[PDB]
Design a protein around this ligand. Structure first.
Ligand SMILES: Nc1ncnc2c1ncn2[C@@H]1O[C@H](COP(=O)(O)OP(=O)(O)NP(=O)(O)O)[C@@H](O)[C@H]1O
Ligand SMILES: Nc1ncnc2c1ncn2[C@@H]1O[C@H](COP(=O)(O)OP(=O)(O)NP(=O)(O)O)[C@@H](O)[C@H]1O
Ligand SMILES: Nc1ncnc2c1ncn2[C@@H]1O[C@H](COP(=O)(O)OP(=O)(O)NP(=O)(O)O)[C@@H](O)[C@H]1O
Ligand SMILES: Nc1ncnc2c1ncn2[C@@H]1O[C@H](COP(=O)(O)OP(=O)(O)NP(=O)(O)O)[C@@H](O)[C@H]1O
Ligand SMILES: [Au+]
Ligand SMILES: [Au+]
Ligand SMILES: [Au+]
Ligand SMILES: [Au+]
Ligand SMILES: [Au+]
Ligand SMILES: [Au+]
Ligand SMILES: [Au+]
Ligand SMILES: [Au+]
Ligand SMILES: [Au+]
Ligand SMILES: [Au+]
Ligand SMILES: [Au+]
Ligand SMILES: [Mg+2]
Ligand SMILES: [Mg+2]
Ligand SMILES: [Mg+2]
Lengths: 270, 284, 236, 264
């Protein structure tokens, strides 16, 4: 019962403006609620509504306290508008960016108890998604949103994560495959939920160091450093405990070796 | 008097022009034999792409439908190339005059007319439409511009018949299994329930100052109304938060009227029993 | 110089305490500062104790302008605006004369806001001390704009912007983008029309006030007026 | 079950101020809330509090903050109870008032109905057991992490916040004082907290406490007494007026109130 009439939403301040998406605040009159709208130019992102069908459907079905509330979606001219809850506390990345700008980071960005609190809620959000056979695909500090009540939710499940990570290449998208290399098999099959576990590990480093391990390198070098070398760590301070052990479990090259969200939801760190 | 009302042109002395419209002109006139100052709507038959033959059924209804909440129609006759509709001159102006007055003052953004005032005006409109519908008639053009007020505070619906007919214009070819929805909708027609929708839009107009899609050209408003779910109070409005003043009883009254399926819409008699119309006060 | 100072109530980048000799405020810190003006909180003296730098300044028992705003906002009298246009004009003229003096001495306040507009028992208006914040102070044709920003830095015109935001604050009760995280306000400022009194029936404020605000809140600092040019504005 | 030994409780952060402090209970494994009460300061002893403590042990209801155990630590009485992480309803109110979004009202009418129904069901349980809460207010409505609504401070806390203490020609007030007040006192309190959720504060919040006592006895308050709030209508104001009758006999029971239009 969320309106798909464009004239029921009063567009207000633009929150974000990137190449793929603009995030704009809007007042929805029938629901008397100030909401967030992610506007996506379909032609610019080389995509279509038919291509995003099952993504939108998954967004319509996956609801959890630790996932940003999705309301509805509709087409306005050449854009798809995704209507969701506006979270007034901002992103965890915003907090990280504030600590660095203040110069309160050269001994660690977020406290270990602060990291444990945020990541547990993120992991419970992922646990729900994985239970429903879904993958988030774009876990990062920028996609962890905070409510003014202190709640922690993952943003960008569905369409947004889909367009940021190669499109329809997961398990949700031969012959005699006995001679196929493992990487060929993975392309036929599609990658699984364990991709989220790796991204979670990088996010853990991000909350502590203030950045992803290879942040300074161009995209192609980041990809080459990740594939040619052993998995990264905090070193690339006041952390050395189960936190590093927890990170090393996530950051394993073989996705099979990585733990599930539920198995990870244990561990002494949390 | 009397009488009755004269069909001779020389018996009427033209006076002040009230509205110089794009189709018709409303001019005050004095009727000598009746010793009464009346209102005459002058409709150029050529300009409105019409003749007397198609207007005869409308005039017939106009001469029969007489009710406290319907502007008193007196008579009609042809003067050269135009039809003169003689009616009672009302001194209070229209509800649109009130709206325009508040919109010009800049006191409209948080609402134009309060709920008590709206309830008072529209319940009288409902009594008028109830009368028309029971007589098997449809107004077809209910809007603030067609709600005239008397000096004493009486509320009367204007332009029933010819004017409403002309303002709104006024399964076949092809094979049904292949026909587009909009082709098939042509033979569906409409009844008195069409007035109930228009009444709901009029409710919004008294609150906001305008109809939902007033900012768009005529072809676009057709498109947007037919394409989208029914409009609500803040649909098409610039500053939507500022209309939070209007309560839920008014909003549920509106949503009763504004349903795509006319069979789901209440009758005028049903609407008169709604909670919102208890806010009606003395007539000014 | 020495104390000679009776440690009293806490008011109160560490703490600020009231002290007797006579009503005086001292600020504890974890050189000059020659500025002296009725519209600026300046230091009488500065001396050391034990890992702390004491800064003696005039005690203002009238609180801040934000205190007045917070009382109004806590009540229901911010329906048609917070502070009256006449009260805003009086308070901000004093602040602007304080900024004019600072800028003429090559100084920048760096933190103008209602919380830093302190009020005296006298009814005096002055901007809070800025000395401690002030302590943390080729051929560019081929430079990227993001490189240019660091090289160009900022000057006194930054105070003029903050002054404009403070004008909105006294009328509305808050800075335009108060509901968003601190590190988001840059993006919110740039990706939207220059902040205004509206960025809702809370406005009985005239065009002259809105005009004054718009002058201050121009993205390019060069287009912003000087404090002296602002003092000439019709609003004041 | 729950240990009466201090050693088994590890004191942590202070929640609020009697002082409320969080503590971890190692046997079993649960972070609990412990209220610490200085006996002499409130001019109270264990002897006068025993009847209050035994009632706390007996009461067991989803809408009542779960009381675990009590024990004396030196000159302090420790009340061990469930820790609720959602805070109080007063905290939510205070936040909305501070940012001035209490214009047109504080809590939504639907939100007030849901919260107060749970409170009223909590009160119904207490009254069924012949008990009186004595201190129903928004600050004593605590929220659970699972969205639960629970009444806090039954027994010792509400008792100490309120205090330890031929009729033919006798005045009605005097008769009331000899008999003592009953459960209908909670119903009035309930009506005051309903105004608190809608306006942000009690009806006489302006005037200083103690003067509000004199003002109450001289008048009779509605929602309008605090200070626009037109979104609250019909059955809500009627519900309040039923609670806020001067004659306690004319106030409805909690069970009668749960049948009111405002609470399907
Ligand atoms: N629901 C929301 N509520 C509040 N803020 C949001 C919400 N969704 C997104 N944002 C913010 O809007 C801005 C832009 O969002 P987004 O388009 O996801 O940029 P991003 O995080 O850089 N992702 P990407 O552009 O794909 O790299 C960011 O500051 C987000 O934190
Ligand atoms: N019987 C009447 N008594 C007094 N005023 C009238 C009467 N009939 C019409 N008017 C006024 O005459 C003016 C013009 O009337 P009309 O020709 O209906 O124009 P309109 O209402 O603007 N319709 P339109 O010109 O097609 O947009 C309006 O201001 C009416 O209020
Ligand atoms: N001269 C003064 N007279 C009276 N009060 C003062 C004076 N100077 C500072 N204060 C108050 O001292 C308190 C703390 O001051 P300060 O050390 O500047 O931190 P602050 O005002 O909170 N600034 P910030 O830490 O950046 O938010 C504030 O409430 C000031 O209003
Ligand atoms: N079991 C609990 N779990 C979580 N918080 C609690 C619990 N009990 C009390 N609190 C909080 O402790 C703080 C102070 O408690 P209290 O001493 O009861 O003050 P209060 O809220 O004014 N109640 P009262 O003093 O009885 O009127 C309040 O913010 C309560 O919300
Ligand atoms: Au794109
Ligand atoms: Au799903
Ligand atoms: Au094979
Ligand atoms: Au015509
Ligand atoms: Au008729
Ligand atoms: Au057919
Ligand atoms: Au200086
Ligand atoms: Au150059
Ligand atoms: Au106590
Ligand atoms: Au009991
Ligand atoms: Au007797
Ligand atoms: Mg994002
Ligand atoms: Mg008309
Ligand atoms: Mg309490």
């Amino acid at each position: 019962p969320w309106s798909i009439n464009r004239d029921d939403y009063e567009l207000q301040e633009v929150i974000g403006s990137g190449a793929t998406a603009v995030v704009q605040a809007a007042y929805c009159a029938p629901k008397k609620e100030k909401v967030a709208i992610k506007r996506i130019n379909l032609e610019k992102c080389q995509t279509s509504m038919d291509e995003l069908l099952k993504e939108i459907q998954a967004m319509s079905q996956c609801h959890h306290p630790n996932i940003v509330s999705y309301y509805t979606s509709f087409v306005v001219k050449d854009e798809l508008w995704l209507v969701m809850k506006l979270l007034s506390g901002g992103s965890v990345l915003d907090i990280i960016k504030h600590i660095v700008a203040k110069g309160e980071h050269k001994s660690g960005v977020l406290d270990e108890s602060t990291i444990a609190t945020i990541l547990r809620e993120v992991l419970e959000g992922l646990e729900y998604l994985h239970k429903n056979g879904q993958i988030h695909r774009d876990v990062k500090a920028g996609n962890i949103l905070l409510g003014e009540d202190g709640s922690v939710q993952i943003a960008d499940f569905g369409v947004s994560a889909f367009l940021a990570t190669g499109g329809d290449i997961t398990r949700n998208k031969v012959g005699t495959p006995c001679w196929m290399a493992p990487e060929v098999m993975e392309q036929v099959r599609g990658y699984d939920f364990k991709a989220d576990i790796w991204s979670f590990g990088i996010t853990a480093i991000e909350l502590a160091t203030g950045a992803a391990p290879y942040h300074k390198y161009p995209p192609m070098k980041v990809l080459m450093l990740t594939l040619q070398n052993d998995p990264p760590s905090l070193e690339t301070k006041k952390y050395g405990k189960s936190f590093r052990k927890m990170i090393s479990l996530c950051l394993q090259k073989d996705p099979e070796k990585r733990p599930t969200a539920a198995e990870l939801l244990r561990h002494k760190f949390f």
